[PDB]
């Protein structure tokens, strides 16, 4: 079709990955700040301390959002497939 419609498709896809990455990262970002401020208050200067806490919540987020991210990738594939007629017409 028109190049603008392709831009809308690519912006929509990049928007989805932003939602995907935000759901995974933000739980780790919050924990990183919580530990960092706690160290600042307690004058603790271990830079590598706040790695496992970020990893734990990141893995937990993946398990917790397992169903939602699946449902979303599959439906996006179906949405594109049902949008193929736009290309053919």
């Amino acid at each position: 079709m028109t190049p603008e419609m392709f831009v809308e498709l690519f912006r929509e896809a990049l928007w989805m990955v932003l939602i995907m990455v935000c759901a995974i990262i933000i739980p780790s970002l919050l924990i990183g700040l919580i530990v960092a401020i706690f160290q600042a208050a307690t004058s603790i200067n271990e830079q590598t301390l706040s790695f496992l806490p970020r990893l734990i919540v990141t893995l937990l987020a993946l398990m917790l959002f397992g169903h939602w991210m699946t449902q979303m990738l599959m439906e996006y594939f179906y949405g594109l497939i049902e949008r193929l007629p736009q290309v053919l017409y």
């Binding site: 190049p3 603008e4 932003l18 700040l33 600042a40 200067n45 790695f51």
Partner: protein, 242 residues
């Protein structure tokens, strides 16, 4: 008549135009892609040459098919075709350059996202049709017999690397400033406590904003492509002296 003249001329009048057409296809963005088989591309070049044959002027009969002068003719037909093909590769890879500079600045494959979309721009804007129209026009204004790329054409085509960086920087200058100012703002705002630092925490923050800025980049990328195509098309016409 002696049948040698009739048969030889058609082979000379077909293969020589085909070589230029085929050489442009193998270097072209879409027809030279790795997805398509050579056989499909070969048939496409054969079909295009047969169809556009009436618009192609008759080649000079002075040059013989079996002679060193005819051998040079085959080589210089390819050079014209590769010249058009490289221009198309220059545009797409510049967008690949645009994708990777944003990705590199995003604390981070993003070139492929731009490469695919730019390929859609090339197909949607009928860029392939224009290139085919350009090569058949090349037969008119740049005849097969007398004519080849001069030294100035080589230097103009060699100067397209500066065109890549200037165009890529122009597209990303607004976004790259945004990426720097937020990262510098994040650095100065969190510099009060050296306990927090950024390291991997800065990696997460930078990449989230970088993806968000790429969403802004795709919002206004089409206008930049239209200006870029005009620059590239003008270069192609300069090569074929149109």
């Amino acid at each position: 008549e002696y049948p040698t003249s009739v048969v030889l001329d058609w082979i000379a009048n077909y293969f020589w135009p085909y070589v230029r057409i085929s050489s442009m296809l193998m270097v072209m963005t879409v027809t030279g892609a790795r997805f398509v088989s050579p056989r499909i591309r070969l048939y496409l070049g054969l079909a295009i040459t047969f169809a556009v044959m009436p618009a192609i002027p008759a080649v000079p009969q002075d040059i013989e098919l079996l002679s060193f002068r005819g051998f040079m003719t085959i080589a210089e037909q390819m050079i014209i075709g590769i010249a058009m093909g490289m221009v198309t590769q220059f545009m797409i890879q510049t967008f690949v350059l645009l994708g990777q500079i944003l990705g590199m600045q995003s604390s981070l494959l993003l070139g492929q996202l731009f490469m695919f979309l730019t390929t859609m721009f090339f197909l949607a804007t009928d860029g392939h049709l224009k290139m085919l129209q350009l090569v058949v026009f090349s037969f008119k204004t740049l005849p097969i017999g007398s004519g080849s790329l001069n030294a100035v054409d080589f230097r103009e085509m060699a100067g397209w690397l500066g065109i890549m960086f200037q165009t890529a920087l122009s597209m990303s200058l607004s976004g790259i400033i945004a990426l720097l100012t937020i990262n510098l703002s994040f650095g100065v705002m969190t510099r009060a406590a050296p306990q927090l630092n950024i390291f991997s925490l800065g990696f997460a923050f930078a990449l989230m904003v970088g993806l968000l800025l790429c969403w802004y980049i795709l919002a206004g990328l089409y206008s930049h492509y239209e200006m870029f195509w005009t620059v590239g098309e003008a270069q192609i016409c300069r090569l074929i002296r149109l």
